[PDB]
Amino acid sequence: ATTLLHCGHLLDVKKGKWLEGVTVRIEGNTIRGIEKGYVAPKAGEKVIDLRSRYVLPGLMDMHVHLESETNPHNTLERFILNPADIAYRSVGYARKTLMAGFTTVRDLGGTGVNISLRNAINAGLIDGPRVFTAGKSIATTGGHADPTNGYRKDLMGDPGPYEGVANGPDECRKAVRQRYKNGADLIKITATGAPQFTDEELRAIVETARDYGMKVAVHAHGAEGMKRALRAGVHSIEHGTYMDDEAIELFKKTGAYYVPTILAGRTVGPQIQKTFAKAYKSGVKIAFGTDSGKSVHGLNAIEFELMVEAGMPPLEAIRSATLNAADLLGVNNLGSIEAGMLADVIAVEDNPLENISTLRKVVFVMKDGKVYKQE
Amino acid sequence: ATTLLHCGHLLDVKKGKWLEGVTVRIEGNTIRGIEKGYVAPKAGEKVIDLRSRYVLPGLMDMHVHLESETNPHNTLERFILNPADIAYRSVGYARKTLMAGFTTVRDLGGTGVNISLRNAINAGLIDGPRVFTAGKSIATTGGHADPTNGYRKDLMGDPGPYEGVANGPDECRKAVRQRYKNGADLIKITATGTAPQFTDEELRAIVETARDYGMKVAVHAHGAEGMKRALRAGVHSIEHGTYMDDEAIELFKKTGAYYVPTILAGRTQIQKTFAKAYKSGVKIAFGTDSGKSVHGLNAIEFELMVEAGMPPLEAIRSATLNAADLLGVNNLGSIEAGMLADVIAVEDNPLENISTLRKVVFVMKDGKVYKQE
Ligand SMILES: [Zn+2]
């Protein structure tokens, strides 16, 4: 099927330049090309009028938790909520995310319901973003992602690699293989609260993950855990609130991405923005991530503002949500509107490079070939 | 050891009369007698001055839960608290109860830590009231005393007689025997939610087993139908009997079972029902279900019983004579020769203003003085 987007302004994020009065030709789910002017439909074709709009690639958020959203009772709800309850809330969370304009997300934590949500969205059952999920986070015993942490001794039990808790390299191998068996796209670990992973454990995780084509994302606020993860060869660091100048040189030599998460934890202080500034000025690779869930879903665009207020130019923020995100995912057909890519397109009212806050009201959303939002 | 109490006013609860300016002579843990005047002490005899005070027997509360106390977080607390945490909290709960003047209590529900608390208090390890506990309450699956109620299915499991959840007469027999094995003094079951949760055959099995092992049966019941099933089964006490039919009151009088209102906890109606019950001549024993209310505020219930029309003397009798009768002990609840020295003292006449019981100035248990303020 053929859909033509008559775009007044279309953002070339690789060039960094707006293209004025162009047509995007989409056949099926793929962008077939960009044509100057507005092209009449030679044969009956679907045309969408975005001439008064600014057009962007579908934004991607590389830190979301689609299973949960914070609530006065999350800690009790951990004991009272069943998988079906989690799924039914995730429905609305995913819909709000997709209609905020984020066509792709990287889910870094759940009970495994996230895998079912991705499969159900991909099957056409529920409206949502393309989800690349880590499934269950991997932690060491008592680690941040240990599922039975804080339980009464009777309800605590002894979680092992099947549950995502590993101690020692071989157990780590089984835990990564278990996440692969469960259908995870990537691996996420909790490296600090103190470093919760030894160098050999991290090496085991990174090598196993690379064997199965899974990247490694690392949640770490402490400096030593970040430096261990970076030396091990992990692909991304989350938050990293305290960063050693040594961690910045590690970032630069390894090429790992830094996902700031300024939005989440703003709620929980301002250190994180200071850290982000020092990272961006240093030349650290940056990918866009909000940690949605602690922050209400569909308010991810707020993070854009916070990144620009910290000194990141709007083009570089939008590139962090598009080009850098697609590179971090390991996908080559998303994050830029050009021939051969997947038709993930959003559109806003005003110039996002002159005011980034325009991104918090997305008026047009199309994921794959299908249009989900056209206000 | 010998102690003399110089009591300005001492309440003879049996005759309902004050005796003025008397001496209570206690040897060891037992009341040896009441003498005219303030008897002058011989050497080695200790004397406590209650000449400005009103002196009454130790109060007893027949619905308390010493393991827990209410807070915005009880529902999350169960998933996080271990038995030791519960014991350490219970320590303070018991101490505050004893200093409120309640020298004897009937703990009607716990996880079994209540049993260890009773054994520890009786061993002299922890300051506390004389405790008579049901241990773990028995309920049917989904009953109010079901331990895994509301848990996610992964954590809920299938609780059975070992856990206090029984279905059918044989499981009930085993659950009562399990409480006996664990060291409980009495059995407590939850017969209603308002929907009735124990079948007549189940109730008969429970009371007959309890009767074999010398244990009384107390029943938490809010609904009328479960209340009447329990009363027909032959239970000893009905607790929180809200929504009570007039026919149930006739059953009450024929069975002789006690009605424990727990008006204080039901302030969260109960008062209208308690008023009708008291007017009908039902046997009433004092109970607060403190635990859901802060421990140490038990005396407030006294107030409410007088507010519903019960005369102060009968409220004090419900906390003393009626309570001791319901427990099945013959040496507690009245200051007279041959009984155990559980004695409290207050500032004003409790029969003219019962709220004076909320300021207990003197507490004596088993001959020992815990409070003399
Ligand atoms: Zn997170």
mmCIF file of N, CA, C and O and ligand atoms in Angstrom, chain A residues 63-65 108-109 137 144 188 190 219 221 238-239 261 264 290-292 294, ligand 1:
data_model
loop_
_atom_site.group_PDB
_atom_site.id
_atom_site.type_symbol
_atom_site.label_atom_id
_atom_site.label_comp_id
_atom_site.label_asym_id
_atom_site.label_seq_id
_atom_site.Cartn_x
_atom_site.Cartn_y
_atom_site.Cartn_z
ATOM 1 N N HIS A 63 15.390 3.980 27.889
ATOM 2 C CA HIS A 63 15.145 3.514 29.250
ATOM 3 C C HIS A 63 13.667 3.718 29.579
ATOM 4 O O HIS A 63 13.238 4.848 29.825
ATOM 5 N N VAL A 64 12.894 2.630 29.548
ATOM 6 C CA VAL A 64 11.509 2.635 30.007
ATOM 7 C C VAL A 64 11.249 1.351 30.782
ATOM 8 O O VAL A 64 11.911 0.330 30.572
ATOM 9 N N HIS A 65 10.300 1.420 31.710
ATOM 10 C CA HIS A 65 9.804 0.261 32.448
ATOM 11 C C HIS A 65 8.296 0.232 32.209
ATOM 12 O O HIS A 65 7.527 0.859 32.939
ATOM 13 N N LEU A 108 14.140 -1.864 30.209
ATOM 14 C CA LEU A 108 15.292 -2.363 30.949
ATOM 15 C C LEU A 108 14.927 -3.070 32.254
ATOM 16 O O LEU A 108 15.774 -3.175 33.147
ATOM 17 N N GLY A 109 13.697 -3.567 32.395
ATOM 18 C CA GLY A 109 13.364 -4.245 33.635
ATOM 19 C C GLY A 109 11.920 -4.661 33.828
ATOM 20 O O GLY A 109 10.994 -3.881 33.585
ATOM 21 N N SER A 137 15.812 -8.278 34.808
ATOM 22 C CA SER A 137 17.156 -7.795 35.082
ATOM 23 C C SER A 137 17.976 -8.871 35.781
ATOM 24 O O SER A 137 17.452 -9.715 36.510
ATOM 25 N N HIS A 144 20.553 -5.007 43.333
ATOM 26 C CA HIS A 144 19.420 -4.100 43.192
ATOM 27 C C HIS A 144 18.255 -4.778 42.483
ATOM 28 O O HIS A 144 17.090 -4.528 42.809
ATOM 29 N N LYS A 188 20.228 -6.548 30.754
ATOM 30 C CA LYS A 188 20.484 -5.433 31.659
ATOM 31 C C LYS A 188 20.896 -5.971 33.022
ATOM 32 O O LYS A 188 20.285 -6.911 33.540
ATOM 33 N N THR A 190 22.508 -4.817 37.138
ATOM 34 C CA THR A 190 22.652 -3.782 38.164
ATOM 35 C C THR A 190 24.045 -3.922 38.771
ATOM 36 O O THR A 190 24.287 -4.806 39.597
ATOM 37 N N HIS A 219 22.968 -0.630 34.772
ATOM 38 C CA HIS A 219 22.483 0.349 35.730
ATOM 39 C C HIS A 219 23.522 0.508 36.833
ATOM 40 O O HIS A 219 23.801 -0.443 37.571
ATOM 41 N N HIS A 221 25.090 3.752 39.540
ATOM 42 C CA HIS A 221 25.359 5.111 39.997
ATOM 43 C C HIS A 221 26.750 5.257 40.590
ATOM 44 O O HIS A 221 27.326 6.348 40.524
ATOM 45 N N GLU A 238 23.633 3.537 32.578
ATOM 46 C CA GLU A 238 22.442 4.292 32.933
ATOM 47 C C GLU A 238 22.693 5.094 34.203
ATOM 48 O O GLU A 238 23.302 4.593 35.154
ATOM 49 N N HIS A 239 22.216 6.344 34.201
ATOM 50 C CA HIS A 239 22.341 7.280 35.317
ATOM 51 C C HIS A 239 23.796 7.644 35.584
ATOM 52 O O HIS A 239 24.230 8.750 35.242
ATOM 53 N N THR A 261 19.186 9.856 32.023
ATOM 54 C CA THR A 261 18.040 9.723 32.926
ATOM 55 C C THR A 261 17.936 10.930 33.865
ATOM 56 O O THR A 261 17.854 10.799 35.088
ATOM 57 N N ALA A 264 13.919 10.999 35.347
ATOM 58 C CA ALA A 264 13.768 10.182 36.568
ATOM 59 C C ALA A 264 14.891 10.543 37.533
ATOM 60 O O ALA A 264 16.039 10.719 37.105
ATOM 61 N N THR A 290 14.784 8.170 29.517
ATOM 62 C CA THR A 290 14.051 8.891 30.542
ATOM 63 C C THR A 290 13.866 8.118 31.833
ATOM 64 O O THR A 290 13.655 8.744 32.875
ATOM 65 N N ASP A 291 13.876 6.779 31.764
ATOM 66 C CA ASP A 291 13.527 5.916 32.935
ATOM 67 C C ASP A 291 12.037 6.125 33.214
ATOM 68 O O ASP A 291 11.670 6.433 34.362
ATOM 69 N N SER A 292 11.223 5.969 32.171
ATOM 70 C CA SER A 292 9.772 6.235 32.308
ATOM 71 C C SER A 292 9.103 5.216 33.233
ATOM 72 O O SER A 292 9.553 4.050 33.263
ATOM 73 N N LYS A 294 8.978 5.567 36.735
ATOM 74 C CA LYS A 294 9.207 6.379 37.954
ATOM 75 C C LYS A 294 8.611 7.731 37.566
ATOM 76 O O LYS A 294 7.966 8.372 38.418
HETATM 77 ZN ZN ZN C 1 15.638 1.785 35.919
#
